[PDB]
């Protein structure tokens, strides 16, 4: 919902770390024209956890929605944006003709045509130059036969062609050798007291009677123990009140 999408030649790769990711909010945005995913199971995405989730957004031609793939081959593929051979993510695209309502077109949308196709994955070659078309370097500017700049997208035919623009949001889920922090949401049930229950406080499983305690912990304490290494107190998150754990009768 940025409402100001970038161009395909300069994509705005945003990094996500230590978040809930609310995987139920992605498909509630709008009907998607292309919802192709990859070696990360979308039905099981909410259960897994990753270290960094890289989000990438750009706009392409309607015929280029089938170009964002590992086994890709095309203009946008080799010259503008390339996915690796082993890509673990999804590609979400929807109709953008209604958003780019401008009969003039050619505004704020440009792409690449030449100059070292098969660009390395996730590397932004935004450096603007002129391709060496001919022997003369043309002093780094336009001139005779050196008419090879990065081209713009002519989104002029508003509601006039089937090659309408589509906004693509590429998600790159990566799990490095580090403690993963972008996990799924963790549900929590209502607290009960004065009864034997099978509790689980932030991963601390046990069985006993939960009662209010007069003991005061330090602000960083989330675990109460006694002699013989027994678990006699907890922090009880979502309320921050200290509870006493006594074994069931």
């Amino acid at each position, epitope marked *: 919902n940025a409402t100001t999408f970038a161009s395909v030649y300069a994509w705005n790769r945003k990094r996500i770390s230590n978040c809930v990711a609310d995987y139920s909010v992605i498909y509630n945005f709008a009907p998607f024209f292309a919802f192709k995913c*990859y*070696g*990360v199971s*979308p039905t099981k995405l909410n259960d*897994l956890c990753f270290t960094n989730v890289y989000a990438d957004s750009f706009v392409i031609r309607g015929n280029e929605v*089938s170009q964002i793939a*590992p086994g890709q081959t095309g203009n946008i593929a080799d010259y503008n944006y390339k996915l690796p*051979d082993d890509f673990t993510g999804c590609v979400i695209a929807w109709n953008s003709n209604k958003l780019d309502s401008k009969p003039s077109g050619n505004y704020n949308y440009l792409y690449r045509l030449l100059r070292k196709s098969k660009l390395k994955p996730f590397e932004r070659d935004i450096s603007t130059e002129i391709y060496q078309a001919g022997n003369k370097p043309c002093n780094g500017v336009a001139g005779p036969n050196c008419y090879s700049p990065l081209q713009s997208y002519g989104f002029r035919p508003t509601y006039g062609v089937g090659h309408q623009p589509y906004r693509v949001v590429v998600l790159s889920f990566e799990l490095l050798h580090a403690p993963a922090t972008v996990c799924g949401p963790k549900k929590s049930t209502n607290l009960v007291k004065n009864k034997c229950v099978n509790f689980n406080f932030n991963g601390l499983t046990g069985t006993g009677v939960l009662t209010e305690s007069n003991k005061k912990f330090l602000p960083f304490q989330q675990f109460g123990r006694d002699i013989a290494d027994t678990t006699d107190a907890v922090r009880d998150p979502q309320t921050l009140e200290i509870l006493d754990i006594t074994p069931c009768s």
Partner: antibody
Amino acid sequence: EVQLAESGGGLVQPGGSLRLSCAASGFTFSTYDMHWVRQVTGNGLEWVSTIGTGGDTYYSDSVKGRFTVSRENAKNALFLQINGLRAGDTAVYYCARGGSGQFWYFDLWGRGTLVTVSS
Amino acid sequence: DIQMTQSPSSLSASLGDRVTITCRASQTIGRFLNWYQQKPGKAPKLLIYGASSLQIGVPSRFSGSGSGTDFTLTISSLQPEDFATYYCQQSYSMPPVTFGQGTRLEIKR
């Protein structure tokens, strides 16, 4: 035992509404994903649609836009509503379950149902 | 989008023979591939999943091999219950899953 039931396959006019049904038995239905795969007479298997544990739905290229898959956590009831059928949609549908793991594979298959669309 | 190319539609072999059903992919899919068996008189059933793991209940005569762009389902000794149709499926792009055209196993005489 463990098996998957099916019902609702039959003849329907082109473009008429149709709703298939699949009933599981023998396992925890609320913790496994379900898939729908068809097979045209003389052709191979063709994935139609699927629904995950979280209720999210997915369809194919020629399937999205006219199909509607649904699933209830209770009663082990699985459904697949279709609208706008055509002659090219005549195929043998199968109810399949998604096994555990990190990739889609059909570890359990149903009895299979036949669907024919003609006037 | 991903396409699969399996062995010819029919393979002729006798009892106890060795059959290596070959199925290739359009690009590198790693090990996200599974095999299935379908007798024309009943519903299909899986035999190999992940191209390396054998399904529980399947005899040890079936064996899956290959990865990336070429997969081969090798059978050591054909039995009367083995003659059926087989299909390979890629699982790299899970929403756009595609199946192979099929391969028939017939008795040689």
